[PDB]
Design an enzyme around this catalytic site. Structure first.
Site, PDB file in Angstrom:
ATOM      1  N   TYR A  90       0.858  -1.186   0.000  1.00 45.29           N
ATOM      2  CA  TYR A  90       0.000   0.000   0.000  1.00 45.29           C
ATOM      3  C   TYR A  90       0.893   1.234   0.000  1.00 45.29           C
ATOM      4  O   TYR A  90       1.562   1.522   0.997  1.00 45.29           O
ATOM      5  CB  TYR A  90      -0.922   0.017   1.216  1.00 45.29           C
ATOM      6  CG  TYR A  90      -2.375  -0.256   0.915  1.00 45.29           C
ATOM      7  CD1 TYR A  90      -3.114   0.599   0.106  1.00 45.29           C
ATOM      8  CD2 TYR A  90      -3.011  -1.370   1.445  1.00 45.29           C
ATOM      9  CE1 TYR A  90      -4.447   0.350  -0.168  1.00 45.29           C
ATOM     10  CE2 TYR A  90      -4.340  -1.630   1.173  1.00 45.29           C
ATOM     11  CZ  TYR A  90      -5.053  -0.763   0.368  1.00 45.29           C
ATOM     12  OH  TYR A  90      -6.377  -1.010   0.094  1.00 45.29           O
ATOM     13  N   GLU A  95      -0.166   4.639  -1.115  1.00 38.43           N
ATOM     14  CA  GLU A  95      -1.017   5.735  -1.556  1.00 38.43           C
ATOM     15  C   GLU A  95      -0.250   7.048  -1.532  1.00 38.43           C
ATOM     16  O   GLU A  95       0.471   7.357  -0.577  1.00 38.43           O
ATOM     17  CB  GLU A  95      -2.263   5.834  -0.677  1.00 38.43           C
ATOM     18  CG  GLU A  95      -3.091   4.569  -0.685  1.00 38.43           C
ATOM     19  CD  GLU A  95      -4.228   4.591   0.318  1.00 38.43           C
ATOM     20  OE1 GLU A  95      -5.381   4.840  -0.096  1.00 38.43           O
ATOM     21  OE2 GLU A  95      -3.969   4.345   1.515  1.00 38.43           O
ATOM     22  N   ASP A 141      -6.713  10.459 -26.805  1.00 37.70           N
ATOM     23  CA  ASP A 141      -6.831   9.109 -26.250  1.00 37.70           C
ATOM     24  C   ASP A 141      -6.277   8.138 -27.288  1.00 37.70           C
ATOM     25  O   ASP A 141      -6.995   7.657 -28.162  1.00 37.70           O
ATOM     26  CB  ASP A 141      -8.276   8.787 -25.883  1.00 37.70           C
ATOM     27  CG  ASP A 141      -8.412   7.477 -25.103  1.00 37.70           C
ATOM     28  OD1 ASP A 141      -7.420   6.715 -25.006  1.00 37.70           O
ATOM     29  OD2 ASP A 141      -9.526   7.202 -24.598  1.00 37.70           O
ATOM     30  N   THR A 152      -4.496   3.215 -22.792  1.00 34.47           N
ATOM     31  CA  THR A 152      -4.364   1.949 -22.102  1.00 34.47           C
ATOM     32  C   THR A 152      -2.987   1.364 -22.383  1.00 34.47           C
ATOM     33  O   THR A 152      -2.277   1.789 -23.300  1.00 34.47           O
ATOM     34  CB  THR A 152      -5.450   0.969 -22.539  1.00 34.47           C
ATOM     35  OG1 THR A 152      -5.424   0.815 -23.963  1.00 34.47           O
ATOM     36  CG2 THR A 152      -6.815   1.465 -22.113  1.00 34.47           C
ATOM     37  N   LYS A 177      -3.154  -2.849 -25.181  1.00 31.61           N
ATOM     38  CA  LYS A 177      -3.549  -3.037 -26.571  1.00 31.61           C
ATOM     39  C   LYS A 177      -2.312  -3.203 -27.444  1.00 31.61           C
ATOM     40  O   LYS A 177      -1.597  -4.204 -27.328  1.00 31.61           O
ATOM     41  CB  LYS A 177      -4.402  -1.863 -27.049  1.00 31.61           C
ATOM     42  CG  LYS A 177      -5.736  -1.743 -26.343  1.00 31.61           C
ATOM     43  CD  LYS A 177      -6.476  -0.515 -26.840  1.00 31.61           C
ATOM     44  CE  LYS A 177      -7.852  -0.390 -26.212  1.00 31.61           C
ATOM     45  NZ  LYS A 177      -7.802  -0.287 -24.734  1.00 31.61           N
ATOM     46  N   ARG A 231      -3.066  -4.692 -18.164  1.00 34.88           N
ATOM     47  CA  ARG A 231      -4.176  -3.746 -18.182  1.00 34.88           C
ATOM     48  C   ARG A 231      -3.928  -2.636 -17.169  1.00 34.88           C
ATOM     49  O   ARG A 231      -3.911  -2.877 -15.957  1.00 34.88           O
ATOM     50  CB  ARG A 231      -5.483  -4.476 -17.893  1.00 34.88           C
ATOM     51  CG  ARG A 231      -5.589  -5.782 -18.635  1.00 34.88           C
ATOM     52  CD  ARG A 231      -6.941  -6.419 -18.434  1.00 34.88           C
ATOM     53  NE  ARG A 231      -7.933  -5.852 -19.334  1.00 34.88           N
ATOM     54  CZ  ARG A 231      -8.120  -6.260 -20.584  1.00 34.88           C
ATOM     55  NH1 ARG A 231      -7.390  -7.247 -21.084  1.00 34.88           N
ATOM     56  NH2 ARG A 231      -9.049  -5.689 -21.330  1.00 34.88           N
TER      57      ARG A 231
HETATM   58  N1  LIG Z   1      -8.970   6.952   8.480  1.00 37.70           N
HETATM   59  C1  LIG Z   1      -8.174   6.797   7.278  1.00 37.70           C
HETATM   60  N2  LIG Z   1      -6.936   6.321   7.355  1.00 37.70           N
HETATM   61  C2  LIG Z   1      -6.180   6.168   6.236  1.00 37.70           C
HETATM   62  C3  LIG Z   1      -4.858   5.702   5.983  1.00 37.70           C
HETATM   63  C4  LIG Z   1      -4.677   5.803   4.608  1.00 37.70           C
HETATM   64  N3  LIG Z   1      -5.779   6.279   4.049  1.00 37.70           N
HETATM   65  C5  LIG Z   1      -5.958   6.526   2.624  1.00 37.70           C
HETATM   66  C6  LIG Z   1      -4.897   7.502   2.104  1.00 37.70           C
HETATM   67  C7  LIG Z   1      -5.168   8.952   2.515  1.00 37.70           C
HETATM   68  C8  LIG Z   1      -4.166   9.945   1.914  1.00 37.70           C
HETATM   69  C9  LIG Z   1      -4.692  11.382   1.973  1.00 37.70           C
HETATM   70  C10 LIG Z   1      -4.861  12.137   0.822  1.00 37.70           C
HETATM   71  C11 LIG Z   1      -5.349  13.438   0.903  1.00 37.70           C
HETATM   72  C12 LIG Z   1      -5.650  13.991   2.140  1.00 37.70           C
HETATM   73  C13 LIG Z   1      -6.204  15.415   2.330  1.00 37.70           C
HETATM   74  O1  LIG Z   1      -7.005  15.560   3.191  1.00 37.70           O
HETATM   75  N4  LIG Z   1      -5.841  16.617   1.577  1.00 37.70           N
HETATM   76  C14 LIG Z   1      -4.895  16.749   0.480  1.00 37.70           C
HETATM   77  C15 LIG Z   1      -4.826  18.236   0.123  1.00 37.70           C
HETATM   78  C16 LIG Z   1      -5.729  19.066   1.038  1.00 37.70           C
HETATM   79  C17 LIG Z   1      -5.510  20.574   0.932  1.00 37.70           C
HETATM   80  O2  LIG Z   1      -5.595  21.149  -0.186  1.00 37.70           O
HETATM   81  O3  LIG Z   1      -5.256  21.244   1.967  1.00 37.70           O
HETATM   82  C18 LIG Z   1      -3.511  16.263   0.898  1.00 37.70           C
HETATM   83  O4  LIG Z   1      -2.908  16.825   1.852  1.00 37.70           O
HETATM   84  O5  LIG Z   1      -2.969  15.305   0.287  1.00 37.70           O
HETATM   85  C19 LIG Z   1      -5.485  13.225   3.283  1.00 37.70           C
HETATM   86  F1  LIG Z   1      -5.786  13.756   4.503  1.00 37.70           F
HETATM   87  C20 LIG Z   1      -5.003  11.930   3.205  1.00 37.70           C
HETATM   88  C21 LIG Z   1      -6.708   6.515   5.015  1.00 37.70           C
HETATM   89  C22 LIG Z   1      -8.043   7.022   4.981  1.00 37.70           C
HETATM   90  O6  LIG Z   1      -8.660   7.394   3.783  1.00 37.70           O
HETATM   91  N5  LIG Z   1      -8.716   7.142   6.117  1.00 37.70           N
HETATM   92  C1  LIG Z   2     -12.650   1.231   4.241  1.00 37.59           C
HETATM   93  C2  LIG Z   2     -11.957   1.400   2.918  1.00 37.59           C
HETATM   94  N1  LIG Z   2     -12.686   1.455   1.780  1.00 37.59           N
HETATM   95  C3  LIG Z   2     -12.136   1.607   0.565  1.00 37.59           C
HETATM   96  C4  LIG Z   2     -10.760   1.715   0.373  1.00 37.59           C
HETATM   97  C5  LIG Z   2     -10.201   1.891  -1.017  1.00 37.59           C
HETATM   98  O1  LIG Z   2      -9.446   0.763  -1.446  1.00 37.59           O
HETATM   99  P1  LIG Z   2      -8.357   1.000  -2.604  1.00 37.59           P
HETATM  100  O2  LIG Z   2      -7.324   1.937  -2.021  1.00 37.59           O
HETATM  101  O3  LIG Z   2      -7.815  -0.362  -2.960  1.00 37.59           O
HETATM  102  O4  LIG Z   2      -9.143   1.634  -3.730  1.00 37.59           O
HETATM  103  C6  LIG Z   2      -9.851   1.665   1.539  1.00 37.59           C
HETATM  104  C7  LIG Z   2      -8.351   1.782   1.381  1.00 37.59           C
HETATM  105  N2  LIG Z   2      -7.729   2.140   2.640  1.00 37.59           N
HETATM  106  C8  LIG Z   2      -6.291   2.301   2.708  1.00 37.59           C
HETATM  107  C9  LIG Z   2      -5.829   2.106   4.131  1.00 37.59           C
HETATM  108  O5  LIG Z   2      -6.700   1.867   4.998  1.00 37.59           O
HETATM  109  O6  LIG Z   2      -4.609   2.188   4.386  1.00 37.59           O
HETATM  110  C10 LIG Z   2     -10.479   1.502   2.865  1.00 37.59           C
HETATM  111  O7  LIG Z   2      -9.716   1.448   3.990  1.00 37.59           O
HETATM  112  C1  LIG Z   3      -9.861   4.927 -26.728  1.00 36.12           C
HETATM  113  C2  LIG Z   3     -10.176   3.992 -25.592  1.00 36.12           C
HETATM  114  N1  LIG Z   3     -10.239   4.436 -24.311  1.00 36.12           N
HETATM  115  C3  LIG Z   3     -10.524   3.634 -23.266  1.00 36.12           C
HETATM  116  C4  LIG Z   3     -10.768   2.271 -23.425  1.00 36.12           C
HETATM  117  C5  LIG Z   3     -11.099   1.379 -22.259  1.00 36.12           C
HETATM  118  O1  LIG Z   3     -10.069   1.324 -21.284  1.00 36.12           O
HETATM  119  P1  LIG Z   3     -10.229   0.147 -20.209  1.00 36.12           P
HETATM  120  O2  LIG Z   3     -11.115  -0.874 -20.878  1.00 36.12           O
HETATM  121  O3  LIG Z   3      -8.847  -0.373 -19.896  1.00 36.12           O
HETATM  122  O4  LIG Z   3     -10.916   0.831 -19.041  1.00 36.12           O
HETATM  123  C6  LIG Z   3     -10.742   1.667 -24.776  1.00 36.12           C
HETATM  124  C7  LIG Z   3     -10.993   0.188 -24.986  1.00 36.12           C
HETATM  125  N2  LIG Z   3     -12.382  -0.126 -25.226  1.00 36.12           N
HETATM  126  C8  LIG Z   3     -12.750  -1.513 -25.427  1.00 36.12           C
HETATM  127  C9  LIG Z   3     -12.359  -2.031 -26.795  1.00 36.12           C
HETATM  128  O5  LIG Z   3     -11.985  -1.221 -27.676  1.00 36.12           O
HETATM  129  O6  LIG Z   3     -12.448  -3.262 -26.995  1.00 36.12           O
HETATM  130  C10 LIG Z   3     -10.423   2.567 -25.898  1.00 36.12           C
HETATM  131  O7  LIG Z   3     -10.365   2.102 -27.169  1.00 36.12           O
END
Ligand SMILES: Nc1nc2ccn(CCCCc3ccc(C(=O)N[C@@H](CCC(=O)O)C(=O)O)c(F)c3)c2c(=O)[nH]1
Ligand SMILES: Cc1ncc(COP(=O)(O)O)c(CNCC(=O)O)c1O
Ligand SMILES: Cc1ncc(COP(=O)(O)O)c(CNCC(=O)O)c1O
Ligand SMILES: Nc1nc2ccn(CCCCc3ccc(C(=O)N[C@@H](CCC(=O)O)C(=O)O)c(F)c3)c2c(=O)[nH]1
Lengths: 456, 459
Positions: free
Chosen positions: B54, B56, B209, B235, B238, B244
């Site tokens: 992770y 982020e 694109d 993408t 392709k 992907r």
């Molecule tokens: N409980 C909780 N815990 C965790 C741990 C990881 N995560 C997920 C990753 C979170 C990373 C992240 C991104 C953006 C901001 C934000 O607030 N602002 C911007 C600019 C603001 C400004 O213009 O001032 C910034 O500073 O990046 C932020 F606070 C945190 C989370 C989560 O989602 N929840």
């Molecule tokens: C409750 C919850 N829901 C959705 C997401 C989004 O998942 P993806 O980042 O894979 O899109 C997170 C990621 N949370 C990051 C962390 O807790 O460190 C999460 O904690």
């Molecule tokens: C110009 C363009 N943009 C975006 C996408 C889709 O991206 P993802 O599927 O990875 O999200 C395609 C493919 N479209 C499906 C096809 O041509 O078979 C595409 O041709």
């Protein structure tokens, strides 16, 4: 050229980076609450030929040809998903195409709400996730707060737990159409029965984002949100120990009778995933998810999830018995919300000190106010996957305490944060104490085995 | 339980399905213009321990610890992305975290536009993608037409080409903030200079694109859209032949008149839209696989591959013309061919099903002058997938031979069937038709199995 050459033979520069990251995971104490070590079975499916197939649509309703095998893989992943959580297919359906947790939530809002409709989620410093509608007072952060109107609910700063009363009061004023009962940094269990009461009164949708606790719910280890929620969203990594993906569980069948009103979630949820938001499904990720969902039904996963609790409770007690206070007091899941304010060190340079010594965590905001948050968030599922047990995590806490003591001892001759991190790399005394603690830290970690491959 | 057991031993049910799909790709003539066969080197990275990390944020501004290695992987992927397309890092940046092409294009709109701001893309039945703002007369289809307001531009149906004149007219009235220059089903090169003039006139961002043509652009076998566009998405699975994922290329530096060097303000808005606005944790395994294939694109092998892709698409086009088929815009200048099957009595829906049953995978395609919807009159055929299997010009002429037999079979079934459901049912129940398909399927599969296949051997 064949495309069958090895990564080591064809791209040695990338292969070295693979081994470095593999060694960093093996030599380190991974305590990020959301990280986990995927099994080799799932990784073999993740890096399979399924990456090559464009299978847009849904099993039976696809737009290309030659999707006969990925139809069965998606249906199997759907079936394995329902039974990892003990759901009746007549009452619950699942979409396995979300690319991750963030896309999965955005698909739920797009499916059920119009743009600028109102949502309510736990605020980010209070433990909620970005995709629950986080906007600060200066800037809209998550797109869930841009395309939808978001008002956060907070915790009780005295209690450390969700202020369910303040939620209910603000819910009838704000009138949200959907409330998210899910957290990213929260050590207690969410009262989904209380969430459903608030949702039934304001006539909103109850979405449960079980991403962090998905494995604990699958193993019937903690209470399940499927009893109260209409829609359940999850990541497939984290405690489910799978590939990076997302799932959307929705209720199907009959809902209510004025004189048989059916559930209308499936078609909307599926259409929001494709063709609204996503393009081609990642079939290699869908299969890796199905692999992990099969491993979730196995009795070893129930024993695994039970072990994550005991080690999270052990890490909580060990940190308490070394002086550290914990937000909400202890834990009830897989993570511990540590409060480093009653120690004199923030969560910022405490993470930098621990990171410098092969201990991975993240700063977390505690019930204060900048670049120096309150404490940290420590997780158990990662190390538990290496058969860490209660005594193992007690050494983790002691290894952490040594890092904190060095951190409190560098704020000695440093002012803010740049002063801190520069001293940890500049003065020869501090670096050696960190390096010495690193050899002992990496030596203790490398002994445990690592799920997945051996060199990548 | 160690988490180190093979998939065959741990999950035999899933391992069988992985092998059945592998066999389906080895034995089929895969003509889906968007599909390709990923190299095993990239697949090794895609299924690696990077799935566990992770991280982020962005390298240097990460909100996690222990991101030392994945920051180098992302940095390498960025440098390899700019190198593969011959871009000065002083005037181009790239974001390598989009999960796919659809999240890539949505991130661009979210970065540069406000909700309900206006975009113009090529209409979907005209060859544009969903994420270019597709919205039917009944329903908003793509979310890019829900969170933003879209008006499509169309092809000139008499030429099969983009009606740049009608685009310039409608854009002056619609006033879009961003125009998408990119296609999913288009056989010709896009006039990026004309798109730039229309954009510069109405003060709109030009988003290119290049998803379908990215590999051709990187090999410099077709004109590059980077010489004209502000933002470039693509993408990576392709013609680039990788895993992907998605990429967002954006300009940097000076975007003066009175007095005042105006700077480009794309980098921060784009990076913020991907994370934290839209996406969460970046998929570092995908990023690594993309970096692997990006290194492959800079090699002389990839230019030969891309040149062969062009040669093979033209060979398929010439072979189709010589057999009485008509092509949208009369030919091709890239990797695909839009076959019009209306002047032969068979619709694309019927031809797609019959070809699929003989292991020839294509997809139906709407022709510029049609609205049957349920029965499009055309087919989209692509060269990149089979070209990776070392197909040559005469190999594709042989493919057209197999296509011609399927069309003739489909023609005979149409004369003995009424609706389309009767057609699809006749192909499996009629003993003679089922037998004729089985012989053609076997001849197709035997021909295809002889060619090498990128990736792993059994999965
Ligand atoms: N409980 C909780 N815990 C965790 C741990 C990881 N995560 C997920 C990753 C979170 C990373 C992240 C991104 C953006 C901001 C934000 O607030 N602002 C911007 C600019 C603001 C400004 O213009 O001032 C910034 O500073 O990046 C932020 F606070 C945190 C989370 C989560 O989602 N929840
Ligand atoms: C409750 C919850 N829901 C959705 C997401 C989004 O998942 P993806 O980042 O894979 O899109 C997170 C990621 N949370 C990051 C962390 O807790 O460190 C999460 O904690
Ligand atoms: C110009 C363009 N943009 C975006 C996408 C889709 O991206 P993802 O599927 O990875 O999200 C395609 C493919 N479209 C499906 C096809 O041509 O078979 C595409 O041709
Ligand atoms: N040139 C181009 N080619 C290709 C090939 C794959 N793709 C990407 C995948 C395209 C998938 C797709 C396309 C259209 C609709 C749609 O119009 N649906 C309406 C009407 C349905 C009906 O006929 O009844 C509705 O749901 O009401 C849909 F729902 C899903 C594209 C692309 O984007 N462009």
């Amino acid at each position: 050229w064949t495309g069958q050459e090895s990564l080591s033979d064809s791209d040695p520069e990338m292969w070295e980076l693979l081994q470095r990251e593999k060694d960093r995971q093996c030599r380190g104490l991974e305590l990020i609450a959301s990280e986990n070590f995927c099994s080799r079975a799932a990784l073999e499916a993740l890096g399979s030929c399924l990456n090559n197939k464009y299978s847009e649509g849904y099993p039976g309703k696809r737009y290309y040809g030659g999707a006969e095998v990925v139809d069965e893989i998606e249906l199997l992943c759907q079936r394995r998903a329902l039974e990892a959580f003990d759901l009746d297919p007549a009452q619950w359906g699942v979409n396995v195409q979300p690319y991750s947790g963030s896309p999965a939530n955005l698909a739920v809002y797009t499916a059920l709400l119009q743009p600028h409709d109102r949502i309510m989620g736990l605020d980010l410093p209070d433990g909620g996730h970005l995709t629950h509608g986080y906007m600060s007072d200066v800037k809209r952060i998550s797109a869930t707060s841009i395309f939808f109107e978001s008002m956060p609910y907070k915790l009780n700063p005295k209690t450390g737990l969700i202020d369910y009363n303040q939620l209910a009061l603000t819910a009838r004023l704000f009138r949200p159409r959907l409330i998210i009962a899910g957290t990213s940094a929260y050590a207690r269990l969410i009262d989904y029965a209380r969430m459903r009461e608030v949702c039934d009164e304001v006539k909103a949708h109850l979405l449960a984002d079980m991403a962090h606790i998905s494995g604990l719910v699958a193993a019937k280890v903690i209470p399940s949100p499927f009893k109260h929620a209409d829609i359940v969203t999850t990541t497939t990594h984290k405690t489910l120990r799978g590939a990076r993906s997302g799932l959307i569980f929705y209720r199907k069948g009959v809902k209510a009778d004025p004189k048989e009103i059916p559930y209308t979630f499936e078609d909307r949820i599926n259409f929001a995933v494709f063709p609204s938001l996503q393009g081609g499904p990642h079939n290699h990720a869908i299969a890796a998810v199905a692999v992990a969902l099969k491993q979730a039904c196995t009795p070893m996963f129930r024993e695994y999830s039970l072990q994550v609790l005991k080690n999270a409770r052990a890490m909580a007690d060990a940190l308490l018995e070394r002086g550290y206070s914990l937000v909400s007091g202890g834990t009830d899941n897989h993570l511990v919300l540590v409060d480093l304010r009653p120690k004199g060190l923030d969560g910022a340079r405490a993470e930098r000190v621990l990171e410098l010594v092969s201990i991975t965590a993240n700063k977390n905001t505690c019930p204060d106010r900048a670049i120096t948050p309150g404490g940290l968030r420590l997780g158990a599922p990662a190390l538990t996957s290496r058969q860490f047990r209660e005594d193992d995590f007690r050494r983790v806490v002691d290894f952490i305490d040594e890092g904190v003591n060095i951190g409190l001892e560098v704020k000695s001759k440093t002012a803010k944060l740049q002063d801190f991190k520069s001293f940890l790399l500049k003065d020869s005394e501090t670096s050696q104490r960190l390096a010495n603690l690193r050899q002992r830290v990496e030596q203790f970690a490398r002994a445990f085995p690592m799920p997945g491959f051996d060199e990548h």
